[PDB]
Amino acid sequence: TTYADFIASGRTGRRNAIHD
Amino acid sequence: KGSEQESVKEFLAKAKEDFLKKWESPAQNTAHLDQFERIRTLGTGSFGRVMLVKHKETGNHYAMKILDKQKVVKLKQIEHTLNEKRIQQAVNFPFLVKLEFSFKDNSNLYMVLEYAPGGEMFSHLRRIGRFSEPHARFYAAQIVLTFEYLHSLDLIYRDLKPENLLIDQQGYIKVADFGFAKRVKGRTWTLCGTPEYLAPEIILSKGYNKAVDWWALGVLIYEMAAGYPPFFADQPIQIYEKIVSGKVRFPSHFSSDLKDLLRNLLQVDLTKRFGNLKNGVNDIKNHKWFATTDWIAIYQRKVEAPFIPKFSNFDDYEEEEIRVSINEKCGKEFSEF
Ligand SMILES: O=C(Nc1c[nH]nc1-c1nc2cc(CN3CCOCC3)ccc2[nH]1)NC1CC1
């Protein structure tokens, strides 16, 4: 499932902005 | 006509006049650090902790954002930080976090924010998994009205995401963190935002406008309703490939109304993206998915929130005292703060 792929990913915590 | 729309245009006209007086004459140096009892760290940003504080002579609680001046310079965020404070002290809207006080010392800038006991939508969203559409719609509607307000002031917000939306004691949203907000008529070029939420024209170095905020609303609605964003991967670079690919898939449980609103918000073609057309914000407000929404009732907070924060409960941090240097750092850079 897509949910399972998300939860196993590295981007489930708070996401930093990019500053270039 | 449009009796509704005429009442909108008149409210915005008065709001813009309030904003412009404050935009041209910013509040400055309205408190001092020793007036605040520092209770605990609520969270962190790029430039320092955000602290739960109590204003000593009123007993009110605030969230005090600390910004190390040298860290701001080193990240080349001086102008963005000056934008942030100048814009935030000037706006006034139910769903915007208020900048109650600001000041600086030798080491830091301080922004004393209105405190939302519920914390960040992000936390509750990840824990619960996803919001049902009526729940997501409640929040989306507040963002719709807030972007209508900000965009009428020629403000672009540029960092919509659940991390930046606070839940107040009544269950309503307050938009926090104006670090990338900018007052611009016409186009701008800064590559800034959060990868999952970047509009395609940003990734493509194309020059862009307020329409990036409407694309970002599409991401937020999707993430609230799905429990994951429409474009994700382990590396931002793979995220950007998907965003510009022109492709998006919706969970099987998205209503067809929801899918239609999101196809017009997550439109890579600027000329077809909702919010950016001839009717502007009203192609969103008058969309099917929002048919049950009483926009005025939302604004004056008459609608019952689907979720009220549990009336201790913070993530623990190691807590250290603020170190103020003996010499002023970066004084000229932040003179107007
Ligand atoms: O400006 C911010 N926050 C706030 C501005 N005004 N009010 C806040 C605020 N920030 C808060 C942070 C928490 C921490 N919780 C941890 C567990 O999950 C829920 C949040 C709780 C209540 C909070 N209220 N930035 C966020 C902390 C990094």
Evaluate: CB of B50 within 6 angstroms of ligand 1: yes
Query: Count of A–B CB contacts within 8 Å?
Result: 51
Q: Which of B42, B66, B88 to mutate to test the pocket of ligand 1 (most atoms within 8 A of CB)?
A: B42
For ligand 1, atom 28, the nearest C-alpha belongs to B43
Give the CA angle between residues B166, B169, B173 to the nearest 5°: 30
- Domain B26-119+311-335 = CATH 3.30.200.20: yes
Residue B179: cis peptide before it, omega within 30 degrees of 0? no
Q: How far is B193 from chain A (nearest CA, A)?
A: 5
Ranges for all domains in chain B classified under CATH 3.30.200.20: 26-119+311-335
A1 and chain B: CB distance < 8 Å anywhere? no
Distance between CA atoms of residues B53 and B45, nearest Å: 16
What b/e sequence results for B57-94 when a residue is b if at least 16 CB atoms lie within 10 Å of its CB, and e otherwise? eeeebbbbbbbbbeebeeeebeebbbbbbbbbbbbebb
Structure's resolution in angstroms: 2.1
Strand partners, B52: B40, B63
CATH superfamily label, B1-25+120-310: Transferase(Phosphotransferase) domain 1 (1.10.510.10)
Ranges for all domains in chain B classified under CATH 1.10.510.10: 1-25+120-310
**What are the E-state strand segments in B140-264?**
155-156, 165-167, 173-175, 182-183
| Closest to B262 (Cα-Cα) out of B219, B198, B199 | B219
- Calculate the CA dihedral of residues B196, B199, B201, B202 and round it to 10 degrees: -60
Distance between CA atoms of residues B35 and B38, nearest Å: 10
Q: What are phi and psi of B324, to 5 degrees?
A: -95, 120
Task: Please name the method used to determine this structure.
Answer: X-ray
**What are the E-state strand segments in B76-179?**
99-104, 108-114, 155-156, 165-167, 173-175
Specify the 3-state DSSP secondary structure of A10.
Answer: coil
Nearest CA in chain A to B196: A15
Q: Which of B60, B100, B120, B178 to mutate to test the pocket of ligand 1 (most atoms within 8 A of CB)?
A: B120
